[PDB]
Motif scaffolding. Sequence first.
Motif, mmCIF file in Angstrom:
data_model
loop_
_atom_site.group_PDB
_atom_site.id
_atom_site.type_symbol
_atom_site.label_atom_id
_atom_site.label_comp_id
_atom_site.label_asym_id
_atom_site.label_seq_id
_atom_site.Cartn_x
_atom_site.Cartn_y
_atom_site.Cartn_z
ATOM 1 N N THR A 13 -25.096 13.605 33.552
ATOM 2 C CA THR A 13 -24.688 13.731 32.158
ATOM 3 C C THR A 13 -25.322 14.956 31.514
ATOM 4 O OG1 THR A 13 -24.554 11.315 32.067
ATOM 5 C CG2 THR A 13 -24.484 12.511 29.976
ATOM 6 N N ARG B 109 -36.072 6.374 32.793
ATOM 7 C CA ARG B 109 -35.370 5.762 31.671
ATOM 8 C C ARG B 109 -36.265 4.795 30.909
ATOM 9 N NH1 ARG B 109 -29.892 5.288 35.265
ATOM 10 N NH2 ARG B 109 -28.958 7.235 34.506
ATOM 11 N N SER C 161 -30.228 8.766 37.037
ATOM 12 C CA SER C 161 -31.317 9.367 36.272
ATOM 13 C C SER C 161 -31.601 10.811 36.668
ATOM 14 C CB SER C 161 -32.604 8.538 36.383
ATOM 15 O OG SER C 161 -32.353 7.167 36.135
HETATM 16 MG MG LIG Z 1 -27.021 8.069 33.969
#
Ligand SMILES: [Mg+2]
Lengths: 447, 49, 443, 442
Positions: C66, C393, C62
């Motif tokens: 990405t 998330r 988190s």
């Molecule tokens: Mg991830």
Amino acid sequence: LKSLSLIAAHSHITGLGLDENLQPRPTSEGMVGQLQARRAAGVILKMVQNGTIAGRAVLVAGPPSTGKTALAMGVSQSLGKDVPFTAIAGSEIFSLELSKTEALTQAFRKSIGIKIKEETELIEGEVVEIQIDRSITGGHKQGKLTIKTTDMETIYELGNKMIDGLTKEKVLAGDVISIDKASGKITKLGRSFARSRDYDAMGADTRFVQCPEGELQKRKTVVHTVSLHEIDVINSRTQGFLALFTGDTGEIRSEVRDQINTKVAEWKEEGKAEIVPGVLFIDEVHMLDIECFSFINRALEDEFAPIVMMATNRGVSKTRGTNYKSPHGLPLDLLDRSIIITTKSYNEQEIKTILSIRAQEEEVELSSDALDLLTKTGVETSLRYSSNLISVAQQIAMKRKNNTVEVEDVKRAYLLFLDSARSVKYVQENESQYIDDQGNVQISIAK
Amino acid sequence: NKLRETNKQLQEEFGEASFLNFQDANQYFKYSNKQKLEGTVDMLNFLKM
Amino acid sequence: VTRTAAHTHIKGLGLDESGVAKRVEGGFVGQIEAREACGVIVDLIKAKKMSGRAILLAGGPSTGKTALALAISQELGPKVPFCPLVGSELYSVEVKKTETLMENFRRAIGLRIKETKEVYEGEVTELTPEDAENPLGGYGKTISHVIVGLKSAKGTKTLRLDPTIYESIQREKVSIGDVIYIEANTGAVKRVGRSDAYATEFDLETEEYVPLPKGEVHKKKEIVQDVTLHDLDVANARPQGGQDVISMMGQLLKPKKTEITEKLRQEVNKVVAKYIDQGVAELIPGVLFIDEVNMLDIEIFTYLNKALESNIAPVVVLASNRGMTTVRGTEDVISPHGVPPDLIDRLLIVRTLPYDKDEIRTIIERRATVERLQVESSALDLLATMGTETSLRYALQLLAPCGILAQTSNRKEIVVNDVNEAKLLFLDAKRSTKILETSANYL
Amino acid sequence: TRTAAHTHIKGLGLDESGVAKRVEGGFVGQIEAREACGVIVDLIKAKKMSGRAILLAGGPSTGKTALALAISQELGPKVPFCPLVGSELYSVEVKKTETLMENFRRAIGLRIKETKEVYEGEVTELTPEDAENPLGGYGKTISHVIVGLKSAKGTKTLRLDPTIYESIQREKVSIGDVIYIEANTGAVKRVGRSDAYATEFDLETEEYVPLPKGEVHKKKEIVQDVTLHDLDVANARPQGGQDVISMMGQLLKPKKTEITEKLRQEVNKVVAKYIDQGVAELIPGVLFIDEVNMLDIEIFTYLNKALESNIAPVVVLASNRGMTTVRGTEDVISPHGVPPDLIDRLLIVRTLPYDKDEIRTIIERRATVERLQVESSALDLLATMGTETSLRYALQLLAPCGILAQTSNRKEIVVNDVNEAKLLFLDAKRSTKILETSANYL
Ligand SMILES: [Mg+2]
Ligand SMILES: Nc1ncnc2c1ncn2[C@@H]1O[C@H](COP(=O)(O)OP(=O)(O)O)[C@@H](O)[C@H]1O
Ligand SMILES: Nc1ncnc2c1ncn2[C@@H]1O[C@H](COP(=O)(O)OP(=O)(O)O)[C@@H](O)[C@H]1O
Ligand SMILES: Nc1ncnc2c1ncn2[C@@H]1O[C@H](COP(=O)(O)OP(=O)(O)O)[C@@H](O)[C@H]1O
Ligand SMILES: [Mg+2]
Ligand SMILES: [Mg+2]
């Protein structure tokens, strides 16, 4: 120069640093140190050049970043072109489509190469005119065609079978064609330059080449550098070249291998084809399966057994495929029929020379004290780490735009990018932060 | 080489008016120079192609 | 209308000209160190001088690995080639993983090619071969070279056409009076259709009646199209296709993928070097990004140990999120992030950092702006809190249900009641395992 | 002129069914071993017993493969010899059983001898022999065809029944071209025009064969040898040029399937049909499998099943193993890794290491094969180090010693040269010692 100029891991070493008496200069040819290793490598290279005996293996022992791959590739470069050098990995041989024994068979086959020569007798000449009495007499009246060259010109009779041959590959003269003297096969090369203005646009077939120079028919020998494996492939399949390019060898049976060996022997005794000594190198052989070990032990005694080079940094450890351990992680059977070369870590002088030559290869200008601190990092860290540090420091310097890489430049580069030791310390002190092996990790931040 | 000799001769002779639309619009022989220049340029770049 | 999937909030690193990352920029809040290192990597790749380098990004989940990868991909631009890759994607079934990863390595780098072709158009009236009045004693005068006067309204020329281009003409079954389009080099034949003159001949016709396109007969156009290296690799290894029966059979032979030998690659490299000496083409580097590397087989690690040694190896950026983990494919080989030390000797380690409450508030409000959803201050505080104690998330996932609960209440803003109801109707991992602890039959 | 630690073996070094010479055929010691080997070779030459197996056991550097090459050399090229290893049995393309079966059928070989009279030469003249048909007919009637044939130092005119016209139509040869004729089966074959006619046309594609050597009529012998495995493959694999199956052989990946047993029995039947007639003759081969330890229990069971066959030739096994766990079952520990069921069904020979004098002789013979000579001092020290280190370490140091002597321009080796040769390269024991003494993962 024909290959890519992009800087590889070792773009500073070109060949071997030995002399005629196989004595290595301390700093030469782009590689520094490993004097005993350099001398042994030159001994092996000289024996390869000799090629009188075969069926031998050689291995290099040393820690990572000691120069095993560097020495292997320097030996390959000093070997030069036209001598078949094959470099493979112990991991890629595990083929889901090819048997490992069969893959090793091709690996051995590609290492050895053969030179084949062939002589050709062809008639080359631009055609002047063609006159055939196909209506007054018909039935292949044996017409006469005139053929010109830049230095000589003659008229050639055409037989009935030649009439039929010229009926195919139709030529209206004003075109350069050549016919083989032996097989009588005519090849249409291209027209003369006077035909360039016949139409504005022509297809891919029409070409306008110069008239052949000299006599009409000429003798020329052509030599081919063709190794054994590709001949195996082309004999295995009706069209073996496509299998060569695509790699769909189809697990060539060993039945044709004896036939191809007999044909090679026939060409050797006839003098048509000659063999060339080859070198096979495998890196990180410590990972390997015992079937491959047994097959290597078997194939090392064959006549068509090129010298095999191994690289391994593993200590006494377990071999893949068996539960028990062994020296170098390799079975003692291989160690029995092998010669082992020992390599050691470089000292601070060798390390700073390596850093300087690598910076020169990278075209990165440095400072003396910057070089000293980079060498200090390289001796505290590994050798491969300081090279990357100076690589990044080059772009940080051009960000600062002040020519040479600065001391504070390298300091900030090291600060921004973690070393292996710092990374391991950060992982250990924050094992909760990272996803542990067991699958547990602390996601919440507040307590 | 054998074509741009004539091309440059024509350009030096009537290259300032034959190429001009106004002069080539009403001129018995100036359009002949214009079209000859266009033709020699066309053969030039076609031979280059 | 507007679709968002956990992204599109970031427009690259957006660093300053000095390389310093500001606090808030382009969907990035804080995180100066990783953004600055990524900008340094951008400076590496834009140098166009070095190859074989690589770097791995490390840290807990988190944290935006990405996000950073997508940022560098965006700032590189569509012109700069990029090859995304997942660790599970490598494991194939037709060929061994080494061929696949060499394929990706070649796919990384690209090359733009300058090319020029010739354009022709006009309607068709003539279908005649070369008359060849002179017999010469060898010709019963006739040829498979149909001379056609290319009747365009602005020009006409009679062409000696190849048997292939005339065969393609026969494929279109052209008649007198229909526009045609041909190529000087390839000879490609395409017809826009019959001319509008013949439209009145038939009350109905499947063939479309079209006007003659405006333009000269012979037209010249140039292209500087950019094509990656491995498309040329597969085209050279396997011909793409053709309209002829021989090409149909040839492409019917072998359409599946297999290994790629280096000799063709080196010949292509040499002809590309010849082109760059001519100036026809100019090379561009490539970036390869691999996802979830901890699972990779030890054989893959060993092969990649030597893959970077090759001069054709481009920069490969890496991401991992593990601590003391054993390398997959091994038994006792345990190391940080599950990677053998021999690989990481040449790699550079960069570590991401966690965030403070204000950072969670900023990312939450940035997301709320991304889905054009307006929220109240109290609901914003509750979301930021529960994100801090549960996860980012979970809050991001339940952002949309809060807006949906607001909308079904005919409210355009998220209230405290909305997030409370969302928590009533949805449970995170923590209370999931709390419930599953007291299970009659694994409830 | 190249070799790989071999080619110094010259057969078995035996005598006329007696005791082998102590140093004969590049051999030293193991007189009983190679005498048993010669007994085995005589048994193979007997070509009577079927499915007999034997294994030789020992340590490393015992020269088992050298002995196997000795059997191969003593057999001669006429007798087929198929080396094999337990590693290649594990085949991805097809099961290990079929690979074993094919390597089994490769050892056996079939020989065929063919006889045929040949008439050849330049056709001097062609004429029919017209006669009168028994049934009254206005048409012609030819009873014979006379052909004049010319070869080297001899010409011949032969009468042919007018059925030869169909053959001459199938051949299309008239005059000035050399032909091929056989006595009984008739028919014609065209090889090419006479070489003296090349000057008639300046340019032509036809290569003009010369006048055939020897007389017009000849009777030559045709000898052909083929392994039964090759005949199996030929009877199995398709062949064609136009039919759909022909390019179904192409455009795909030709894979070796498990050959049906009916094909094998049918080819055995036709081999019997051609051997009782005398055209064919069967000579058993041998399958040499070394490092059989690597084979799995499945292979051992299939060998147990297949050793009783009546087309089963002698099979020789080589392994350096002893009391070792069998591959496939950890609990089962059997001698040489082979399960005892096979061992009872085969014979076993023990191999022993080589003595100091034998190692000296080995070193000197290898030096002579290398065409490099060693003086007494270097020979003695090399023998001592080979005795203390290993056989192969001393064996393989000749090439570095030779190249180092060449660098110093001395033809032979000396004490400091061989000392340097020892210094550069380390053996297995030194490698292990430096492994434990090194803490840098080396
Ligand atoms: Mg991830
Ligand atoms: N002779 C040498 N001269 C300069 N650099 C060297 C030399 N030998 C090794 N290196 C350095 O070692 C690194 C590569 O190590 P390598 O030899 O691939 O490790 P291994 O021995 O495990 O194969 C390179 O970065 C290179 O700079
Ligand atoms: N520093 C940050 N700034 C903005 N968004 C972030 C930050 N860190 C993480 N994110 C968010 O995390 C999401 C991606 O998470 P991801 O990187 O896939 O998790 P992991 O860290 O496990 O790879 C993105 O949608 C992004 O908005
Ligand atoms: N009688 C002999 N005389 C000389 N050399 C021999 C003799 N027997 C074996 N050798 C040597 O042994 C080597 C072959 O050993 P090999 O059979 O491969 O090892 P192992 O028997 O341990 O499997 C040959 O290179 C040969 O030089
Ligand atoms: Mg290496
Ligand atoms: Mg042996």
